[PDB]
Design an enzyme around this catalytic site. Structure first.
Site, PDB file in Angstrom:
ATOM      1  N   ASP A  67      35.457 -23.630  42.664  1.00 41.26           N
ATOM      2  CA  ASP A  67      34.896 -24.726  41.875  1.00 41.26           C
ATOM      3  C   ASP A  67      34.599 -26.019  42.637  1.00 41.26           C
ATOM      4  OD1 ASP A  67      34.080 -26.008  39.498  1.00 41.26           O
ATOM      5  OD2 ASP A  67      36.105 -26.834  39.198  1.00 41.26           O
ATOM      6  N   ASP A  71      27.832 -28.089  41.122  1.00 44.20           N
ATOM      7  CA  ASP A  71      29.070 -27.463  40.652  1.00 44.20           C
ATOM      8  C   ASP A  71      29.034 -25.943  40.513  1.00 44.20           C
ATOM      9  OD1 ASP A  71      31.508 -26.893  39.505  1.00 44.20           O
ATOM     10  OD2 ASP A  71      31.007 -27.765  37.545  1.00 44.20           O
TER      11      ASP A  71
HETATM   12  C1  LIG Z   1      39.267 -33.541  36.240  1.00 50.81           C
HETATM   13  C2  LIG Z   1      38.026 -34.074  37.006  1.00 50.81           C
HETATM   14  C3  LIG Z   1      37.073 -32.911  37.400  1.00 50.81           C
HETATM   15  C4  LIG Z   1      36.387 -32.330  36.155  1.00 50.81           C
HETATM   16  N1  LIG Z   1      35.210 -31.546  36.558  1.00 50.81           N
HETATM   17  C5  LIG Z   1      34.555 -30.842  35.632  1.00 50.81           C
HETATM   18  O1  LIG Z   1      34.896 -30.810  34.458  1.00 50.81           O
HETATM   19  C6  LIG Z   1      33.343 -30.056  36.112  1.00 50.81           C
HETATM   20  C7  LIG Z   1      32.110 -30.940  35.821  1.00 50.81           C
HETATM   21  C8  LIG Z   1      33.242 -28.708  35.345  1.00 50.81           C
HETATM   22  C9  LIG Z   1      34.195 -27.714  36.043  1.00 50.81           C
HETATM   23  O2  LIG Z   1      33.556 -27.148  37.218  1.00 50.81           O
HETATM   24  C10 LIG Z   1      34.585 -26.561  35.098  1.00 50.81           C
HETATM   25  C11 LIG Z   1      35.511 -25.576  35.825  1.00 50.81           C
HETATM   26  C12 LIG Z   1      35.823 -24.376  34.918  1.00 50.81           C
HETATM   27  C13 LIG Z   1      35.563 -23.073  35.370  1.00 50.81           C
HETATM   28  C14 LIG Z   1      35.838 -21.968  34.550  1.00 50.81           C
HETATM   29  C15 LIG Z   1      36.369 -22.159  33.262  1.00 50.81           C
HETATM   30  C16 LIG Z   1      36.634 -23.465  32.800  1.00 50.81           C
HETATM   31  C17 LIG Z   1      36.366 -24.571  33.633  1.00 50.81           C
HETATM   32  N2  LIG Z   1      33.461 -25.873  34.493  1.00 50.81           N
HETATM   33  C18 LIG Z   1      33.159 -26.161  33.213  1.00 50.81           C
HETATM   34  O3  LIG Z   1      33.764 -26.988  32.547  1.00 50.81           O
HETATM   35  C19 LIG Z   1      31.997 -25.393  32.618  1.00 50.81           C
HETATM   36  C20 LIG Z   1      31.438 -25.994  31.294  1.00 50.81           C
HETATM   37  C21 LIG Z   1      30.255 -25.109  30.775  1.00 50.81           C
HETATM   38  C22 LIG Z   1      30.782 -23.681  30.487  1.00 50.81           C
HETATM   39  C23 LIG Z   1      31.379 -23.027  31.786  1.00 50.81           C
HETATM   40  C24 LIG Z   1      31.953 -21.572  31.501  1.00 50.81           C
HETATM   41  C25 LIG Z   1      33.099 -21.568  30.471  1.00 50.81           C
HETATM   42  C26 LIG Z   1      30.840 -20.657  30.935  1.00 50.81           C
HETATM   43  N3  LIG Z   1      32.498 -21.037  32.765  1.00 50.81           N
HETATM   44  C27 LIG Z   1      31.693 -20.899  33.842  1.00 50.81           C
HETATM   45  C28 LIG Z   1      32.338 -20.393  35.117  1.00 50.81           C
HETATM   46  O4  LIG Z   1      30.499 -21.167  33.817  1.00 50.81           O
HETATM   47  C29 LIG Z   1      32.488 -23.927  32.397  1.00 50.81           C
END
Ligand SMILES: CCCCNC(=O)[C@H](C)C[C@H](O)[C@H](Cc1ccccc1)NC(=O)[C@@H]1CCC[C@H](C(C)(C)NC(C)=O)C1
Length: 373
Positions: A35, A220
């Site tokens: 990530d 990302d």
């Molecule tokens: C605390 C300060 C840093 C915060 N950073 C973030 O929130 C970033 C912007 C998003 C993360 O990369 C998160 C990582 C993640 C991966 C897998 C499962 C959950 C979280 N992905 C997201 O939040 C995405 C939000 C949109 C939907 C996708 C989904 C659930 C479909 N998973 C993937 C891999 O795409 C996840």
């Protein structure tokens, strides 16, 4: 030996890419999602309906409890746990071992995906956005400081089951074709960049470039889709709807919720336009662009009836926290996170599994003003 790191990633479409790692002594094997959108290294450390296995601190003799809790909320999903340190290694990566911070996830919500195959997450961004604060050194920083591994890594995410490569410590020339084009990392917290222009179907969106980076634009690997600020998302969808006027799709499709199918091999790619994103370049008034094909932003999904129709999902969604260049955007390219020189490089990826492009130079005035403040 980067050859040993080629194809060290895998996963399922829309569920992220993970790499194998080991923590503690004796070594405990676990699959960790890559990530670049976060900076915390965390692994399930307690039973969970979707966890095949988890980190067992008691079984590790090198484990050290930091006696401090931690909470991390993502765009989607969140978890909390106990901070500590332990020895970590990457089997199909650099042949080294280092002590790094590890968040032992004791509780989570909408984080672990049922049948993803990964039990942790590796935040590759900077300490600035680490929780609880920037004093918790991220994994990559520990690696670079404790070893001789150069300060950079590269990602080759291949589209649809899915596979890819994370080259740690350098660039693998066999993973891409053509030249590498670099855009400056605006600030070291998220991997933030600046988009100076956007075209869809060869037509410029004619929007104030600041709109493209409101309130920021990040790269990302942990987000599947291409997320755009509300105003930009609306303009994009409009342009994309028109270009494909020949056909009609449910409103749920344009929300990335529903899915549209077609007869195996009859997918109308010609009705879906390409998207060009221009990025700030490295010399004065210079930029470059990456072109995203429908084969990228139309993520393939499981067939409803039976294996015979190619179904897809609109892999572009709206965002209220800035632009997010997710996996579908990264798939078409070999992406170099050159931390040492504060820049991100893009080149056409070697993975075919038609093709996207990276072209330059282009001229753009006041590129820095496209960034939001
Ligand atoms: C605390 C300060 C840093 C915060 N950073 C973030 O929130 C970033 C912007 C998003 C993360 O990369 C998160 C990582 C993640 C991966 C897998 C499962 C959950 C979280 N992905 C997201 O939040 C995405 C939000 C949109 C939907 C996708 C989904 C659930 C479909 N998973 C993937 C891999 O795409 C996840």
């Amino acid at each position: 030996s980067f050859v040993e790191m080629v194809d060290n990633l895998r996963g399922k479409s829309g569920q992220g890419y993970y790499v194998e790692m080991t923590v503690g002594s004796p070594p405990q094997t676990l699959n960790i999602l890559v990530d670049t959108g976060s900076s915390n290294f965390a692994v399930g450390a307690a039973p969970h309906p979707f966890l095949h296995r988890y980190y067992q601190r008691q079984l590790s003799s090198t484990y050290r409890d930091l006696r401090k809790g931690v909470y991390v909320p993502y765009t989607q999903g969140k978890w909390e746990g106990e901070l500590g340190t332990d020895l970590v290694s990457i089997p199909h990566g650099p042949n080294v071992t280092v002590r790094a911070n590890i968040a032992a996830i004791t509780e989570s919500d909408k984080f672990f995906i049922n049948g993803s195959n990964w039990e942790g997450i590796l935040g590759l961004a900077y300490a600035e956005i680490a929780r609880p604060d920037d004093s918790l050194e991220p994994f990559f920083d520990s690696l670079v400081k404790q070893t001789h591994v150069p300060n950079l890594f590269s990602l080759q995410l291949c589209g649809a089951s899915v596979g890819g490569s994370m080259i740690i410590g350098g660039i693998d020339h066999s993973l891409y074709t053509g030249s590498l084009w670099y855009t400056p990392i605006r600030r070291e917290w998220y991997y933030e960049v600046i988009i100076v222009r956007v075209e869809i179907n060869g037509q410029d969106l004619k929007m104030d470039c600041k709109e493209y980076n409101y309130d920021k634009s990040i790269v990302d690997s942990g987000t599947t889709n291409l997320r755009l600020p509300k105003k930009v998302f609306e303009a994009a969808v409009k342009s994309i709807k028109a270009a494909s006027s020949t056909e009609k799709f449910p409103d749920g499709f344009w929300l990335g919720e529903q899915l549209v199918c077609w007869q195996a091999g009859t997918t109308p790619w010609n009705i879906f336009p390409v998207i060009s994103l221009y990025l700030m370049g490295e010399v004065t008034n210079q930029s470059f662009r990456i072109t995203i094909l429908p084969q990228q932003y139309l993520r393939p999904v499981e067939d409803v009836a039976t294996s015979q129709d190619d179904c897809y999902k609109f892999a572009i969604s709206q965002s209220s926290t800035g632009t997010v260049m997710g996996a579908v955007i990264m798939e078409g390219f070999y992406v170099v996170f050159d931390r040492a020189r504060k820049r991100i490089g893009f080149a056409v990826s070697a993975c075919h599994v038609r093709t996207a492009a990276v072209e330059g130079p282009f001229v753009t005035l006041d590129m820095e003003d496209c960034g939001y403040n």
